[PDB]
Design a protein around this nucleic acid. Structure first.
Length: 52
DNA sequence: TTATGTAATACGTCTGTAACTTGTTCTTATGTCTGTTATGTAGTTAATATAATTGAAGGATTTTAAGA
C-alpha cells in the first residue's frame, strides 16, 4: 500500500517548490497505509468516518 | 226415496319466511411519489525522516527422499 502511495506521490511531484521528495512522499504513504488499514483490516467493514 | 244440510277430508293457495344475489356506498389498508437529512465515499496535506519481528523451547520413535 505504501508502494502505491509512492507511485501516486511521484505522479504529482513538483521540484520548483524546492522541498525534498521525502517530505511529500511521506504524507501520501501515510494516507495509503491509513486508508488501506481502515478499508481491509476488519471482517465487517466499518466506514472511514466511523473509523475516525 | 230423495232433497237437504251438516261434517270429515283432501287439495289448492295466499301469504309470510327465508335463501340467493346484486348495487352501491363508505371506509381503510397499501403502494407509490416526493422532499429532506444523514451516511458513505473520495482527494489532499510540502522542515526531514530511507533493510521487521516476536517468540520458543525435557519427544520418541519410525519411514522416506536428498546430499555426498
Amino acid at each position: 500500500e505504501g508502494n502505491i502511495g509512492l507511485m501516486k506521490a511521484v505522479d504529482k511531484f513538483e521540484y520548483r517548490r524546492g522541498y525534498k521528495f521525502s517530505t511529500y512522499a511521506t504524507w501520501w504513504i501515510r494516507q495509503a497505509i491509513t486508508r488501506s488499514i481502515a478499508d481491509q483490516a476488519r471482517t465487517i467493514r466499518i466506514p472511514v468516518h466511523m473509523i475516525e
